[PDB]
Design a protein around this ligand. Structure first.
Ligand SMILES: C=C1[C@H](O)CC(=C/C=C2\CCC[C@]3(C)[C@@H]([C@H](C)CCCC(O)(Cc4ccccc4)Cc4ccccc4)CC[C@@H]23)C[C@H]1O
Lengths: 11, 249
């Protein structure tokens, strides 16, 4: 799963 | 007897702590003044999809806030990055529906975000169809939630339980997600027993989990609308990068 934006908001 | 008293355990210090944390998390992520709404593409009422840019911005902002809340839920951060993502993709729309109850008003059955322009009623939300399958049941859902008259503590617990659901499609560590949810569910059950008086308490836990069932159905119904809409690239164009990433293209 490539979700840079979600991943960035999560970190 | 001590034996009977152990059977009805009060809320633990850890349980009170979980509640404190979720309330603080909610208060950080839900601004009841709706001040940021002024930065959204304007609502247009006067195509029948003229509200889509504004509602796209509203949903996209709300995904962002849901992520901020989710991150604070105790134990969420112990999940893998992958399960974090799958739980949030799966729940986002349901948590938005649920969190929206705080702006919803029985007086005119609308979501009132503090301005006539930021007041959303059945005529605005029905413009993309799916009125029987999605819109009417969503409004029904908002009414049922008001009737429960949840304490804010119950409301924040139910959002958190919604997010950390082990039966979501794509979850890897189902056992771990179940263990985090059970700690939350048990907090809620004990909360209700200790702090929620009858008659409002009656079957309150079961009725709250029934709202989670209804949300799965709304989620399915919205997903169908989304796939229909997004199939026309001119609609998908009015959406936001976060909405596309989280809900799919
Ligand atoms: C901050 C708050 C405040 O409480 C305000 C708030 C309100 C939430 C609402 C009230 C408005 C209507 C909302 C957004 C529901 C539906 C998603 C609406 C369907 C959107 C619709 O699917 C389009 C859309 C798709 C994907 C992302 C965003 C929008 C179809 C449509 C298109 C044009 C006109 C009408 C409908 C779901 C939840 C509904 C959200 C909450 O997070």
């Amino acid at each position: 799963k490539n979700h840079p934006m979600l991943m960035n908001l999560l970190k | 007897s001590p034996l009977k008293d152990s059977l009805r355990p009060k809320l633990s210090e850890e349980q009170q702590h979980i509640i404190a944390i979720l309330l603080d998390a909610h208060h950080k992520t839900y601004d009841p003044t709706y001040a940021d709404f002024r930065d959204f593409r304007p609502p247009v009422r006067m195509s029948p999809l003229s509200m889509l840019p504004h509602l796209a911005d509203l949903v996209s902002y709300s995904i962002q806030k849901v992520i901020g809340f989710a991150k604070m839920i105790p134990g969420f951060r112990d999940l893998t990055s992958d399960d974090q993502i799958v739980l949030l993709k799966s729940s986002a729309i349901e948590v938005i529906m649920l969190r929206s109850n705080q702006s919803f008003t029985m007086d005119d059955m609308s979501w009132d975000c503090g301005s006539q322009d930021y007041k959303y009623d059945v005529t605005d939300v029905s413009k993309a169809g799916h009125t029987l399958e999605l819109i009417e049941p969503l409004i029904k859902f908002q009414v049922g939630l008001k009737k429960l008259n949840l304490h804010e503590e119950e409301h924040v617990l139910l959002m958190a339980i919604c997010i950390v659901s082990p039966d979501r499609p794509g979850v890897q560590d189902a056992k771990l997600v179940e263990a985090i949810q059970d700690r939350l569910s048990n907090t809620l059950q004990t909360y209700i027993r200790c702090r929620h008086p009858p008659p409002g308490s009656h079957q309150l836990y079961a009725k709250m989990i029934q709202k989670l069932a209804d949300l799965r159905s709304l989620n399915e119904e919205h997903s169908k609308q989304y796939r229909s809409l997004s199939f026309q690239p001119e609609n998908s164009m009015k959406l936001t990068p976060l909405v596309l990433e989280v809900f799919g293209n």
